[PDB]
Amino acid sequence: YGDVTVTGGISVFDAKFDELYVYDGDDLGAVYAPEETRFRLWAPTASEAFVVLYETEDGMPVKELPMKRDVQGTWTLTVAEDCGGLFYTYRVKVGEQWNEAVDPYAKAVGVNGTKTAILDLRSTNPEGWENDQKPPLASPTDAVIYELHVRDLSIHPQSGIREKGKFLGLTEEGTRGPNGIPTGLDHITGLGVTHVQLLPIYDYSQESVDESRLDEPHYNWGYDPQNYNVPEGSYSTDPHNPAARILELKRLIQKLHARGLRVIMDVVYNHVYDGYLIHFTKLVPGYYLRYKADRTFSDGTFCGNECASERPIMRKYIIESILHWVREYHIDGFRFALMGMIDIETMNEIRRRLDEIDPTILTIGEGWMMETVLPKELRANQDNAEKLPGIGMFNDGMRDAVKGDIFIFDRKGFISGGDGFEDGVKRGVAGGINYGGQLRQFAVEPVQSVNYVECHDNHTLWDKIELSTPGASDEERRAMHRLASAIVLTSQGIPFLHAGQEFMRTKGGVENSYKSPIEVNWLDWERCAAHQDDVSYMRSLIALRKAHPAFRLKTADEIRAHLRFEAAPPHTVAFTLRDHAGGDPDRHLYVLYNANPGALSLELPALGPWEVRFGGEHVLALEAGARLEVRGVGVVVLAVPR
Ligand SMILES: OC[C@H]1O[C@H](O[C@H]2[C@H](O)[C@@H](O)[C@@H](O[C@H]3[C@H](O)[C@@H](O)[C@@H](O)O[C@@H]3CO)O[C@@H]2CO)[C@H](O)[C@@H](O)[C@@H]1O
Ligand SMILES: OC[C@H]1O[C@H](O[C@H]2[C@H](O)[C@@H](O)[C@@H](O[C@H]3[C@H](O)[C@@H](O)[C@@H](O)O[C@@H]3CO)O[C@@H]2CO)[C@H](O)[C@@H](O)[C@@H]1O
Ligand SMILES: OC[C@H]1O[C@H](O[C@H]2[C@H](O)[C@@H](O)[C@@H](O[C@H]3[C@H](O)[C@@H](O)[C@@H](O)O[C@@H]3CO)O[C@@H]2CO)[C@H](O)[C@@H](O)[C@@H]1O
Ligand SMILES: [Ca+2]
Ligand SMILES: [Ca+2]
Ligand SMILES: [Ca+2]
């Protein structure tokens, strides 16, 4: 951990270390120009530091230059020759140990991320990149998220996409699949979703996907971070060419924006893929990651380590990393893996730094309550959401109430006939806010509640239903599935959909498919071709939400003012959104979630001449008390016209 004489007697573990070496510059890394390249490395506990230069990604050094000790724990060096096309690493001696690492501020790397690449990053911008414009977004509750893996999207043999498994595969328009159905980008833009959330597209570890063996089967979600500030090599057409993955990701984002879609990056700042080998511990051992009392890794992540976001240089790394994805790649939002492992101060400064640039940039995360050496009152989780204004959190209470518990596989939920889940559904209809009485969750405002019944984790909705409806036919399970999706899209808050949920995606019952083959993980376009009715259904639900601002209320005060739950029997939920809620064109809406297969009659509130808006196929009678008779599991939406 180092010669503790170099750092004023104070160890990397004492609390007086932090305020000592707080570098105030935003110039860490290397800045290339033809005249010179300047390097700055933060490594306060090292005795020596060298820049090592390479001509080829897997060559031997051509120069090995010593760096000068500089201010606030940093080392500098200027090289007064055109270093374009060169690769480099940092070699440091920490105590009596030498290690050679990639630059933590690497913005480009060679294959598998072991050497930093020097290049003019403005040569990676696609044509017109400076003219890139974002689709409008007035409120987070106006977003419809679609969670997608780059490999899943196109790797099925019948996807009809040329660059299968690649960033460029999501740039291709006009692709067709079995029976000529639209696939890929056209299928996604055809749905009406507004944001594509991509599973890890930063550079994840070689042990997960080896970028030199892409000619053999491979698959991994990528939750194993290696280089935080550069794209994953296996999604490029050429992982050996350091510029290719950058240019190709930018082409992807530019095209999505041009087609009306925004891009959310799944980011993992809570843990690295290997606390022993990552560059953080090579360069400053004992700083960037969290430690138990015995100076072993705190392991709240169940992955091996935790990043010490609360320490100032690590908070600065995370924030400069995010601002890099925003500024260099034009990213529109971030989903924070295990946000409950990150401290509140870091999350709020992130929200602030983004708001300074563009408040429509999204920040959502997993606010789970989880043990770690990070103090309980400092965790950015649902318990502390009052301290995290404007940050959305996955609403697991809503998820479990709708489809049934994710950990006990056979337990039913509201859609599958379970008893007593109506209040759980109502709590998420209200956007997870403090609505009143028993109707309360963690959110202060509905922008803090992300509604979902499916994501990449755990069984798919279809697979969950299959595990918990032993006496249900296939048609019955389809109706349950459809009802679950309708609840997400008609609840206050931020609706979130899993790619392929529109065609009842299955993983053959695999619960945790993170390294399962493409046969398990691909978007199955043959299944999608067999489920075009259900895709149309999902497309129409998304259109219904878009056509009604009353479903997207911006504040908890509006929800408390305009949302009212109505008389309804067990296994149903009924509510109204009254008096042009949020400027809705209709005067009132009435919404019915029916989980009963049979027929039933409801007395509608006396709000005016009701008219059908959605789900007419379930309506046996609508008569002006005013009466509605329906049959079958699903949603019915009525309106009192203006
Ligand atoms: O080899 C490292 C690591 O692999 C396995 O952990 C993986 C999980 O099993 C897998 O579900 C996935 O977990 C991530 C969630 O999907 C994601 O939503 C995110 O928020 O965080 C989770 C990771 O923290 O990926 C991990 C990492 O690959 C295995 O179970 C571990 O024991 C093993 O250390
Ligand atoms: O080995 C520990 C644990 O790992 C796995 O749990 C993961 C879940 O699959 C994943 O959904 C998420 O779980 C969170 C729930 O979604 C949320 O409702 C609430 O319960 O917090 C949970 C996290 O604490 O992340 C965990 C990560 O461990 C696996 O499925 C479990 O069986 C296993 O016990
Ligand atoms: O557009 C509003 C409309 O959306 C929903 O209707 C969809 C059906 O639920 C879905 O099964 C599908 O059904 C149609 C077939 O695609 C088509 O081949 C033909 O058979 O007509 C079917 C019935 O319309 O697509 C529709 C349209 O998206 C919702 O159920 C309706 O209540 C709603 O009015
Ligand atoms: Ca990689
Ligand atoms: Ca905000
Ligand atoms: Ca099955």
Q: Which residues share a beta bridge with 591?
A: 575, 637
How far, CA to CA in Å, does 62 sit from each of 109, 170, 420? 18, 39, 71
Which ligand is closest in space to the CA of residue 231?
A: 4
Q: How many residues does the chain have?
A: 642
- Which ligand approaches the C-alpha of residue 638 most closely? 3
Helix (H, G, I), strand (E, B) or coil at 324: helix
Measured distance CA(58)–CA(631) in Å, rounded: 68
Does the beta carbon of 338 lie inside 6 Å of ligand 1?
yes
Q: Which residues surround ligand 4, an ion (CB under 5 A)?
A: 203, 232-233
Q: Which ligand does the CA of 616 lie closest to? A: 3
Half-sphere exposure of 128 (CA within 13 A, CB side): 9
Q: Is residue 317 in contact with ligand 1, taking CB distance under 6 Å? A: no
Nearest CA to ligand 1 atom 6: 303
With tokens 């983004």, the residue in question is 354
Cα distances from 529 to residues 161, 241, 455, 534, 632, in angstroms, run 15, 37, 21, 10, 25
Cβ atoms of 564 and 589 closer than 8 Å: no
From the list 342, 132, 372, 227, the residue with the least C-alpha distance to 351 is 342
d(CA 412, CA 405) in angstroms, rounded, equals 7
H/E stretch holding 428: helix 422-429
Residue 476 CA: distances (Å) to CA of 85, 416, 481, 482, 614: 60, 9, 9, 10, 19
Q: Is 575 close to ligand 1, i.e. is its CB under 6 Å away?
A: no
573 DSSP β-pair partners: 593
- For residue 593, which of 410, 398, 459 has the smallest C-alpha distance? 398
The response to whether residue 510 sits with its C-beta less than 6 Å from ligand 1 reads: no
Residue 102's H or E segment, with its range, is: none
Q: Which residues have C-beta within 8 Å of that of residue 527, sequence separation ≥ 6? A: 500, 503, 504, 505, 506
Q: Which of 1, 285, 302, 243 is nearest to 125 (CA)?
A: 243
Please, which residues have CB within 8 angstroms of residue 290's CB and are 6 or more apart in sequence?
297, 298, 300, 305, 306, 307, 308, 372, 373, 374
Residues with CB under 6 A from ligand 3: 533, 536-537, 540, 614-617
Task: Select from 198, 205, 223 the residue to mutate for testing ligand 1; criterion: most ligand atoms less than 8 Å from CB.
Answer: 223
As annotated, the binding site for Ca(2+) includes 203-204, 211, 232, 466
Q: Does the Cβ of 370 fall within 6 Å of ligand 2?
A: yes
- How, if at all, do strands 588-594 and 634-640 pair? antiparallel
Alpha carbon 514 to its chain's center: 15
Chain breaks in the chain (C to N over 2.5 A) after: 624
- The string of DSSP codes covering 243-293 is THHHHHHHHHHHHHHHTT-EEEEEE--S--S-TTTSHHHHHSTTTSB-B-T
Q: Which residues are annotated as a binding site?
A: 203-204, 211, 232, 466
Q: Which residue type is seen at 414?
A: F
Q: For the stretch 299-312, what's the b/e string if a residue is b when 16 or more beta carbons lie within 10 angstroms of its beta carbon? A: bbbebebbbbbbbb
Rounded-to-integer distance, Cα 362 and Cα 332, Å? 6
Burial class (CB in 10 A: 0-12, 13-18, 19+), 133: exposed
Distance CA(95)–CA(44), nearest Å, equals: 12
Ligand 2 neighbour 368 (Cβ under 6 A) = yes
Q: Is 304 in the pocket of ligand 1 (CB under 6 A)?
A: yes
Mutate to test the pocket of ligand 3, among 475, 483, 536, 631 (most ligand atoms within 8 A of CB): 536
Q: Is 235 helix (H, G, I), strand (E, B) or coil?
A: helix
Residue identifier of the C-alpha nearest atom 13 of ligand 2: 368
**CA torsion, ordered 439, 443, 445, 446, to nearest 10 deg:** -80
Q: How far is the CA of 360 from the centre of ligand 4 (A)?
A: 30
Instruction: Give the neighbor-by-neighbor strand order of the sheet with 572-577.
Output: 563-565, 572-577, 588-594, 634-640, 611-614
Question: What is the number of the ligand closest to the CA of 507?
Answer: 6
| CA pair distance 129, 313, nearest whole angstrom | 32
Neighbours of ion ligand 5 (CB under 5 A): 390
- Residue type for 470, please? P
Cβ partners under 8 Å of residue 352, min gap 6: none
Q: Which residue has the CA at smallest separation from atom 15 of ligand 3?
A: 533
Judging by DSSP bridges, how do beta strands 333-336 and 362-365 pair with one another? parallel
**Sheet with strand 599-603: strands edge to edge:** 599-603, 627-631, 619-623
